[PDB]
RNA sequence: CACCAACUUCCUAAACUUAAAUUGGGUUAAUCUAUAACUUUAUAGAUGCAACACUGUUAGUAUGAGUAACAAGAAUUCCAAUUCUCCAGGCAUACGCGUAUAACAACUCGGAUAACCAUUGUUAGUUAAUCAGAAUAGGCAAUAAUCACACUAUAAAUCACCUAUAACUUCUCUGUUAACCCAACACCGGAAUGCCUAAAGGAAAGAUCCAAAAAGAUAAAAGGAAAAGAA
RNA sequence: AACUGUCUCUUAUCUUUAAUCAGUGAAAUUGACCUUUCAGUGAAGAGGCUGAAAUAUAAUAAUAAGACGAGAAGACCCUAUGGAGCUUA
């Protein structure tokens, strides 16, 4: 549907420059102490979260190799151990995952 | 094609005398070819006009539009050269004096339709122009008070000059 | 009380079944925020079925249908259920993650089973009592 | 008992009388020549010499409009990685196409948007004695098939081998890839034959929301045109 | 005739559409427009004329019942001491 005459640039300029059509500023921006990067007040930091996922992938890779087959999910609890930490009696009766890396500072 | 925005960045002012105030730095940066509509980029440019360097970066980081990501890269590049070449001592001491987008050369193609129709396909490109002035953004406007408006009206009445009389 | 998801009611449960199976296997899953919230209730109720007891015949039918991989069925009754015996609820932790930068800008969240062996998530921390405002509130508390 | 109001009229300076086919006369932009001028001019001689309008022609850029419009199953331990949910015409040859094949490298253009490549660049490829394509002169032939027997029929349906002549030891050439072709297209349909029906081949979900209205499908308290029978 | 949500008499769910985010991106159209209501005038006739009336700016979202709506050489029939073409023995 076309108007019976061409729409003037002046008319068009007013429509696009109306405040309703302009981009709004956001004041909910926050700083992440953990990563030192920006975050939203309702959103978690991704720089630190990225570390968790990367460690999770590495941990998951170790578990997959240890299982050695599909549909081999243990019926017993699982635990992760890093270099410098040795399985204890409390770790008995739990699947033990060994990580070549030392215990991460953030991970406890 | 014209590239005078870069030439504006090549302007060299005469050496300032010792008894002359330190000239505020002006940085002209632009991205000539962007596969984006200028109008959409203009909306981003309009909002960021007059804002500080840090404030603009924070707003862009949480913006969902593709153009905003492009602007942030352009803004980051402008800040880097401003310190590197325009002698900007403080990274935070920068504000967006000017921000605007321009049309770029497009590509022409025909848009086929499944049932024998055709259309005019166009690949849009745009230019983005920003001028950065070292220093904090200027203070915002303050609306006139009732007293200010009233005084002007009285002054206007007094300022009236009689017409076509001796 | 239910999100309109899937090409049909079966698809939602099958999609939930796929989501539930993955979470049990890995114990921490990243998915769109809406899906994570929808499936959080099912996961909590599943843990209750594990608490009900391994011998419970009804639990097996629920576990068998919901968990496509049957190796997880022993895990639920012998890993998840023992783990959550002390807990009375809140077995699942769901947190909002920044939206995917995949040109669709979907709302993302991460849902995990509490007590897992995975590294702790970067949870938010409330302000410490040592802060000036908290210290002032502490003085008011002491006087009262 | 007036005033207002037309260039009618007067007044200062000037001027010397009021539709439109047609007809007489005086100038002029531009380009070139002759001869001059010399911040862009003159006198002559010339012409492809002046466009808001020929269903005029070419190019640029707007408006409609950032509108109509368009798109990928789930999780993970990862795009020649696993597993889960779900779908059910697949494989060969013919024809056609002619490198669209594959690896790598790119992420601009092409895919009717991306991712990813089918795009761009580079290099490779399709292997044949077996698969496929690329001597002569005479003499002399009644009876279909149908499990061909019986059995009938009408619609009427089968070189050889002899007699002579002539030659006298051979494996090259060419085709071989592919998701491919004809439909302006990575089209929705068109496309001969054999095998077989999942062991082969596949993904409806760009995200969010759960508006109304609209489209399709399912369900109906009581009723049954306000089951498939008759005229 | 029956049958059934066709309907009396509609309701509910699912799918499509819908709404929001991001990416890409046409078509018919277009004298210019700072684009109002009422009565008048006029050729059936006025957003733009006469006289009244109303009126911060800019935006945003919805519906097609009537004006026996507006219209074309659409549709239909008939005529000619109209033409012209055709056939001739
Ligand atoms: Zn952090």
């Amino acid at each position: 549907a076309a108007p019976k005459n061409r729409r003037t640039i002046e008319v068009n300029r007013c429509r696009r420059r109306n405040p309703q059509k302009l981009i709004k500023i956001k004041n909910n921006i926050d700083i992440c102490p953990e990563c030192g990067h920006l975050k939203q007040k309702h959103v978690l930091c991704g720089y630190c979260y990225e570390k968790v996922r990367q460690e999770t992938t590495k941990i998951r890779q170790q578990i997959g190799a240890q299982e050695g087959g599909p549909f081999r999910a243990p019926s017993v609890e699982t635990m992760v151990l890093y270099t410098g930490e040795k399985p204890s009696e409390k770790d008995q009766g739990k699947r033990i995952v060994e990580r070549n890396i030392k215990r991460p500072s953030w991970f406890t | 094609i014209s590239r005078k925005w870069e030439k504006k960045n090549k302007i060299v002012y005469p050496p300032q005398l010792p008894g002359e105030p330190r000239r505020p730095a002006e940085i002209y940066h632009c991205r000539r070819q962007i596969k984006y509509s200028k109008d959409k980029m203009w909306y981003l440019a309009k909002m960021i006009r007059g804002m500080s360097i840090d404030q603009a970066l924070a707003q862009l980081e949480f913006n969902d539009k593709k153009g905003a990501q492009i602007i942030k890269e352009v803004l980051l590049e402008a800040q880097d050269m401003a310190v590197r070449d325009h002698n900007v001592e403080f990274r935070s001491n920068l504000h967006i004096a000017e921000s605007t987008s321009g049309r770029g050369q497009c590509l022409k193609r025909i848009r086929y339709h499944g049932r024998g129709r055709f259309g005019i396909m166009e690949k849009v490109y745009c230019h983005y122009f920003v001028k950065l002035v070292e220093g904090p953004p200027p203070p915002p406007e303050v609306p006139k008070t009732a007293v200010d408006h009233a005084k002007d009206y009285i002054q206007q009445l007094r300022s009236r000059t009689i017409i076509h009389t001796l | 009380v239910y999100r309109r998801l899937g090409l049909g009611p079966e698809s939602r449960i099958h999609l939930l079944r796929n989501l539930l199976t993955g979470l049990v296997r890995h114990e921490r899953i990243e998915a769109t925020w809406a899906r994570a919230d929808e499936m959080r209730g099912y996961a909590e109720k599943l843990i209750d079925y594990g608490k009900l007891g391994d011998t419970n015949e009804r639990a097996m039918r629920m576990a068998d249908f919901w968990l496509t991989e049957k190796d997880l069925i022993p895990k639920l009754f012998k890993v998840l259920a023992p783990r959550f015996q002390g807990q009375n609820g809140n077995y699942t932790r769901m947190l909002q993650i920044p939206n995917r930068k995949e040109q669709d800008r979907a709302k993302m969240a991460v849902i995990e089973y509490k007590g897992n062996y995975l590294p702790p998530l970067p949870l938010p921390h409330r302000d410490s009592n040592l802060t000036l405002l908290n210290q002032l509130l502490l003085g008011l508390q002491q006087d009262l």
Side-chain angles (χ1 to χ4, degrees):
Chain A
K4 202 83 196 179
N5 274 286
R6 162 169 186 283
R7 296 178 83 187
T8 78
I9 180 59
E10 296 84 2
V11 167
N12 290 343
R13 197 183 281 91
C14 285
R15 186 190 58 258
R16 55 178 64 92
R17 292 182 191 200
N18 179 311
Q20 180 267 329
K21 301 206 178 286
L22 298 171
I23 301 185
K24 292 74 176 178
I25 284 181
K26 73 183 81 75
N27 56 1
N28 54 11
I29 300 177
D30 196 10
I31 289 179
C32 174
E34 292 74 3
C35 49
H37 288 92
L38 292 189
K39 69 183 303 299
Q40 270 173 114
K41 291 149 173 285
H42 63 291
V43 180
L44 268 62
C45 179
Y47 173 105
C48 299
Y49 178 73
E50 187 55 35
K51 308 180 316 206
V52 180
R53 179 46 176 226
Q54 286 149 342
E55 190 48 33
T56 292
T57 56
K58 295 295 145 202
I59 289 165
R60 277 195 190 119
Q61 280 141 20
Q62 180 70 357
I63 283 170
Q66 290 157 338
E67 280 203 8
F71 320 106
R72 308 287 217 289
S75 61
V76 69
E77 305 280 347
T78 307
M79 171 174 323
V80 174
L81 292 180
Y82 287 76
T83 43
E85 310 172 323
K86 298 78 178 189
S88 67
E89 63 277 17
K90 292 152 187 165
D91 312 342
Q92 291 295 323
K94 312 184 43 170
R95 172 170 65 173
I96 308 308
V97 180
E98 287 301 333
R99 307 278 302 103
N100 49 11
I101 306 165
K102 188 258 170 191
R103 170 65 61 102
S105 62
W106 53 282
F107 174 54
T108 309
Chain B
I1 67 166
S2 63
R3 303 294 176 253
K4 296 177 181 178
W5 207 249
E6 283 72 334
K7 302 218 161 175
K8 292 170 86 80
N9 197 9
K10 311 171 195 171
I11 294 165
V12 175
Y13 301 74
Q16 285 178 303
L17 318 182
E20 188 176 351
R22 192 163 200 86
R23 175 150 301 111
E26 296 201 321
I27 302 91
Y28 298 82
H29 191 235
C30 47
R31 182 165 294 182
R32 292 302 180 161
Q33 291 303 117
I34 310 151
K35 181 75 206 55
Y36 208 64
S37 181
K38 64 185 168 49
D39 190 358
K40 291 163 185 162
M41 201 73 79
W42 189 95
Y43 274 105
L44 290 158
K46 175 56 168 278
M47 176 194 72
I48 64 183
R49 282 169 196 186
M51 282 166 34
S52 64
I53 183 61
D54 309 288
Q55 183 201 354
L57 286 166
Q59 298 297 309
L60 283 167
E61 169 169 342
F62 298 91
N63 210 318
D64 301 334
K65 287 190 180 297
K66 175 177 80 70
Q69 176 59 33
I70 294 158
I71 294 170
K72 176 155 52 59
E73 298 161 358
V74 162
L75 184 61
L76 288 165
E77 296 158 11
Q79 184 166 16
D80 189 359
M81 56 189 70
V83 172
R84 184 170 62 70
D85 306 321
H86 296 95
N87 181 32
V88 173
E89 179 161 24
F90 309 99
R91 306 185 316 194
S92 80
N93 206 31
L94 282 154
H95 72 274
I96 296 90
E98 306 203 36
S99 84
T100 192
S101 65
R103 182 182 181 276
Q105 294 187 354
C106 300
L107 313 169
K108 279 72 183 170
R109 317 275 191 270
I110 180 165
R111 188 188 307 99
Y112 304 79
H113 287 84
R115 293 290 89 196
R117 306 291 295 163
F118 66 108
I120 313 311
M121 173 175 290
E122 195 69 29
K123 313 309 304 165
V124 63
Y125 291 76
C126 75
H127 293 41
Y128 192 70
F129 298 164
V130 294
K131 183 201 90 175
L132 299 189
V133 169
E134 182 269 6
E141 184 63 26
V142 56
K144 288 173 72 178
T145 63
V147 181
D148 309 332
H149 273 285
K151 290 165 155 35
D152 295 4
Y153 174 76
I154 285 148
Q155 287 170 0
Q156 188 273 326
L157 283 172
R158 290 169 176 277
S159 287
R160 287 184 297 155
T161 70
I162 191 63
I163 306 167
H164 301 144
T165 194
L166 180 56
Chain C
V1 298
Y2 68 101
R3 291 182 171 78
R4 302 208 296 104
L5 317 170
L7 315 187
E10 180 144 33
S11 168
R12 171 159 162 282
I13 289 294
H14 287 357
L15 277 161
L16 283 167
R17 153 161 83 177
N18 288 297
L19 291 160
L20 187 41
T21 303
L23 179 53
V24 168
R25 168 159 303 287
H26 306 98
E27 303 187 28
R28 180 178 300 161
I29 298 299
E30 294 67 36
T32 50
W33 186 100
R35 304 296 76 68
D37 188 74
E38 193 75 343
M39 191 260 288
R40 199 184 185 166
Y42 283 91
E44 301 277 325
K45 290 155 187 182
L46 176 75
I47 296 304
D48 293 336
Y49 266 92
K51 284 162 180 228
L52 273 179
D54 203 350
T55 57
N56 189 4
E57 63 276 15
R58 203 185 63 270
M60 184 62 72
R61 296 180 61 265
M62 194 78 75
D64 190 27
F65 172 89
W66 279 93
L67 292 163
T68 49
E69 301 161 343
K70 310 315 181 184
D71 51 329
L72 309 175
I73 314 294
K75 173 165 158 182
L76 165 71
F77 296 114
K78 295 143 200 177
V79 184
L80 296 178
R83 181 189 316 172
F84 294 118
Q85 290 306 334
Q87 313 197 14
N88 280 346
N90 320 309
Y91 318 117
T92 62
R93 180 189 299 290
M94 181 195 151
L95 302 164
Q96 177 168 354
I97 305 301
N99 282 34
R100 60 174 59 156
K101 275 77 72 176
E102 290 168 37
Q103 195 262 330
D104 67 299
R105 306 295 300 165
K107 200 175 195 263
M108 302 312 297
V110 60
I111 193 168
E112 68 159 25
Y113 286 162
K114 290 186 199 156
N116 63 44
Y117 60 89
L118 306 165
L121 284 175
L123 316 179
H125 287 94
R126 270 198 182 277
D127 270 326
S128 164
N129 283 259
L130 303 180
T131 61
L132 183 85
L133 170 53
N134 289 129
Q135 288 298 279
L136 282 160
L137 277 169
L138 172 54
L140 177 55
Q141 159 71 45
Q142 286 153 345
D143 280 331
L144 292 187

